[PDB]
């Protein structure tokens, strides 16, 4: 993600976009980047356009290490 003006130079957060059209946030820790296989340079995008895609759950190692008996349908 980067600013919308034509002269912006920042880079504030990393996102993954699936071909089904949903964005998932990626925690930029060295362990998360290497486990997913995202040790690569990201392409820039404008927030005014990217915000229009629906947001899913965050991807992180500490987040996936959980057990569930059954999952709540709703």
């Amino acid at each position: 993600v980067t600013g919308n003006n034509p002269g912006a130079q920042t880079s504030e957060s990393l996102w993954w976009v699936t071909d089904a059209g949903a964005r998932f946030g990626v925690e930029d820790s060295k362990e998360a980047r290497d486990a997913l296989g995202l040790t690569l340079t990201p392409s820039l995008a404008p927030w005014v356009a990217l915000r229009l895609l629906p947001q899913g759950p965050t991807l992180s190692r500490a987040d996936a290490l959980v057990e569930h008996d059954t999952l709540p349908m709703d």
Partner: protein, 129 residues
């Protein structure tokens, strides 16, 4: 820890500023300077994010009063609309002298006026430290 709760009956009584007990100065005010090799003709890097050159098109914020609660501010020819509000550390102060060299940076970072060929107020009546 639980989120705070509020009781509006406890409002403190209004009155002129003053310390709760007599106090005295214990140390000399800190000195200030410039780092080797700096050049103030280039814009500060933090201004690249704010894009102020496009935001000022709707006006520079005329007529808004901002209160700075801190170590006070020292007058300067670049701050033409500074107002003294009072002092709680020293009983006789106006709240207009920055011994810690902190209030002047916070304040000047908000309202300092850009450079011009001549200053609006050439006088300099400020007292010594």
């Amino acid at each position: 820890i639980s989120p705070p709760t509020i009781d509006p009956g406890a409002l403190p009584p209004d009155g002129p500023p003053g310390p709760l007990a007599p106090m005295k100065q214990n140390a000399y005010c800190t000195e200030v300077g410039v780092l080797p090799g700096t050049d103030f003709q280039l814009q500060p890097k933090y201004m690249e994010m704010l894009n102020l050159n496009e935001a000022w098109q709707f006006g520079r914020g005329d007529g808004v009063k901002v209160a700075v609660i801190d170590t006070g501010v020292t007058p300067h020819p670049r701050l033409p609309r500074l107002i003294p509000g009072g002092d709680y550390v020293m009983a006789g102060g106006d709240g207009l002298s920055d011994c810690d060299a902190h209030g002047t940076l916070v304040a000047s970072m908000i309202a300092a006026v850009p450079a011009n060929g001549a200053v609006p107020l050439p006088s300099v009546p400020r007292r010594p430290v």
